[PDB]
DNA sequence: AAAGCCCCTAGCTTTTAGCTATGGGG
DNA sequence: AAAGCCCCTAGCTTTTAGCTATGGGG
DNA sequence: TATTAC
DNA sequence: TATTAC
C-alpha cells in the first residue's frame, strides 16, 4: 500500500487531466496509441505508477501514485513536454496545425491513498 | 472546492504525520499549544489550508490542502524546521535533552480532493 | 473570462523543443 | 530493520538552526 | 496568434 | 550517539 523513499513513507494518488491546445480532437487512432506508450515509458523512468489512463479525442486522464518528494508537477511536465516533442516529430499534422500540442494547464485532484481501514493505523492510534 | 494558481486547477489534500526524535512524549501542555500556533502561522504564510490538526504526546497529525505546484514537502520542511527552531528556543528542556526536536521522516497519504459527485465532472464525460 | 485564448521570462528536457512557475501581463 | 537509531553532504530557513533530498552509508 | 471544457 | 511506532 505504502511505499517509501529514504525519508518518507507515502501513498499519494492523483487524478490528472489535460487537453490538447485549442481542445483539438487529436487524441485518436495512432496518436492515442503512441501517447499512452510514451506516458508509460515516462512513468517507468520516473518511478511513477500508472493506475489508470484513459483517453478521449480531446483529453487524457491519468490516475497515478507519485512520490511527494519527487512532485506530481515534475511527472506532469515531463509527460507533457516529452509527449509533445515526440508526437510532433512523429505525426507531422500535429506540428503543422498547432503551435504546441498541449496547453500550459492541467487539472489535479488527490485520491485516497489507501482504504480508511489501512490509513487509520497511521493517523489515529 | 477547486482552487487554481496561474496554470493549474486543483484540490490536493494530505494526511501528514510525524513524531518527535526518539518518539519522546514531549507534545504536551504549553509545547503542544505553541506547536499548533506555529504551524498555523506557517500554513497562513505558505497559503496552505489546515483542515484539521491534532497532537498526541508523541505525534502530530495534520490534514491539509496544498497547491501541488508548491509541494507538500515544502510545507512539511517549513512546518517541522521552524517549529523545531522556535520550540527549542522557547522550551530549554527540548534543546538540552534532544539533538533535534523531530526526525528526518514523516508519513503522507493523499485524501480525496472533493466529493465523488464533483470529481467525476472533471475526469469523465 | 481563464485552465483552457493572446503575450512575457527563465529553468530543464531520455524533448535543446516545449513543457513548467504556489511565475507574470492582458 | 528503517521512517523512526547511528553516520554523511548540499540547500534552504529557522541561520554558533534544523529541517529536506524520488539524496547517500551502516 | 484565438480555445470554450475534461 | 541509540528509537521501536503514529
Ligand atoms: Mg537516511
Ligand atoms: Mg498564464
Ligand atoms: Mg476563428
Cα distance between the two ends of chain A: 18
CA pair distance A84, A18, nearest whole angstrom: 12
Residue length of chain B = 125
Q: What's the grid cell of residue B58?
A: 508523541
Q: Which domains does chain A have, with CATH numbers?
A: 1-125 (3.30.70.1290)
CB contact under 8 A, A109 and B119: yes
Query: Please, which contacts does A23-32 make with residues 24 or more away whose CB atoms are closer than 8 Å?
Result: A23/A58, A24/A58, A24/A97, A24/A98, A25/A57, A25/A58, A26/A57, A26/A58, A26/A94, A26/A101, A27/A55, A27/A56, A27/A57, A27/A58, A27/A59, A27/A60, A28/A57, A30/A91, A31/A87, A31/A91, A31/A94
DSSP string spanning B7-43? Answer: SEEEE-EEEEEE-BGGG-----HHHHHHHHHHHHHHH
Q: Is B22 a catalytic residue?
A: no
Q: Which residue has the cell 472533471?
A: B122
CA pair distance A33, A95, nearest whole angstrom: 18
Q: How big is the CA angle at B63 (ends B40 and A72), to the nearest 5 degrees?
A: 105
> How many beta-carbon pairs below 8 A join chains A and B?
116
CA pair distance A122, B108, nearest whole angstrom: 9
CA pair distance A114, A1, nearest whole angstrom: 7
CB contact under 8 A, A56 and B125: yes
Q: Which residues contact A102 (CB under 8 A, 6 or more apart)?
A: A18, A19, A20, A21, A80, A83, A84
Breaks (C-N over 2.5 A) in chain B follow: none
| Residues of chain B neighbouring A7 (CB-CB closer than 8 A) | 104-106
Sign of the dihedral through C-alpha B119, B122, B124, B125: positive
| Residues of chain B neighbouring A113 (CB-CB closer than 8 A) | 15, 108-111
Q: Measure B16 CA to ligand 1 centroid, in angstroms.
A: 19
CB contact under 8 A, B17 and A122: yes
Element (H, E) at A96: helix A92-96
Q: Which nucleotides of E are covered by protein (CB under 7 A)?
A: 1-6
Test the B interface: residue of A69, A107, A117, A124 with most B CBs within 10 Å = A107
- Determine the 3-state secondary structure of A8 from DSSP: strand
Q: Which residue has the cell 511527472?
A: A75
A106 DSSP β-pair partners: B8
Name the structure determination technique.
Answer: X-ray
| Of A71, A122, A125, Cβ closest to residue B109 | A122
CA pair distance A83, A85, nearest whole angstrom: 6
* Ligand that lies nearest to the alpha carbon of residue A22, given by its number in the listed order: 3
CB contact under 8 A, B14 and A73: no
Test the A interface: residue of B103, B107, B115, B124 with most A CBs within 10 Å = B107
* Residue spans of alpha helices (H) in chain B: 29-45, 72-90, 92-96, 116-123
CA pair distance A123, B11, nearest whole angstrom: 21
Amino acid at each position: 500500500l505504502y511505499k517509501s523513499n529514504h525519508n518518507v513513507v507515502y501513498s499519494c494518488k492523483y487524478h490528472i487531466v489535460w487537453c490538447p491546445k485549442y481542445r483539438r480532437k487529436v487524441l485518436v487512432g495512432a496518436v492515442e496509441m503512441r501517447l499512452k506508450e510514451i506516458i508509460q515509458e515516462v512513468a517507468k523512468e520516473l518511478r511513477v505508477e500508472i493506475i489508470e489512463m484513459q483517453t478521449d479525442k480531446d483529453h487524457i486522464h491519468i490516475l497515478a501514485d507519485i512520490d511527494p518528494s519527487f512532485g506530481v508537477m515534475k511527472f506532469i511536465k515531463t509527460a507533457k513536454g516529452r509527449s509533445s516533442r515526440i508526437l510532433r516529430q512523429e505525426f507531422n499534422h500535429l506540428k503543422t496545425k498547432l503551435p504546441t500540442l498541449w496547453t500550459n494547464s492541467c487539472f489535479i485532484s488527490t485520491v485516497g491513498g489507501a482504504p480508511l481501514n489501512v490509513v487509520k493505523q497511521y493517523i489515529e492510534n
